[PDB]
Amino acid sequence: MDEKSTKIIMWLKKMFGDKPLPPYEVNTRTMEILYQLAEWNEARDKDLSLVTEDLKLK
Amino acid sequence: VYRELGSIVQELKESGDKLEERLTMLSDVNLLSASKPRSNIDSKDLTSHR
């Protein structure tokens, strides 16, 4: 739980940049949802980067 | 007679050199027909890697 939590905090820091992370209720459910979202975003960002670079080449 | 023979040898030599250069060029592996596509993806093929 401690690893997933770290990944979420890092991911939120990346998404919100220089803006202070908004306070939210940290419970088992909110963490699971955020974790799924973080995994999904990371996987999609990777895919979109590869597509964007290819389109430049094309 | 020496000058005339000398000119003929030079012409034949220049022609010979130019032929060797062209043959070397035509023997380049990249120009030679459809080698069966390579089984491995070339490092230069960025699209297939992506």
Curated annotation (Swiss-Prot), chain B:
Q: Which residues form a coiled coil?
A: 1-30
- Localization per record: Cytoplasm, Cytoskeleton, Microtubule organizing center, Centrosome; Cytoplasm, Cytoskeleton, Spindle
**Can you list the disulfide-bonded cysteine pairs?**
none
Protein's job: Contributes to mitotic spindle assembly, maintenance of centrosome integrity and completion of cytokinesis as part of the HAUS augmin-like complex.
Quaternary structure (record)? Component of the HAUS augmin-like complex. The complex interacts with the gamma-tubulin ring complex and this interaction is required for spindle assembly.
The record's family statement is:
Belongs to the HAUS3 family.
Report what the protein is called.
HAUS augmin-like complex subunit 3
| Species per Swiss-Prot/TrEMBL record | Xenopus laevis (African clawed frog)
What are the leading ranks of the lineage? Eukaryota, Metazoa, Chordata, Craniata, Vertebrata
Part of the whole protein covered = 399 to 448 of 597
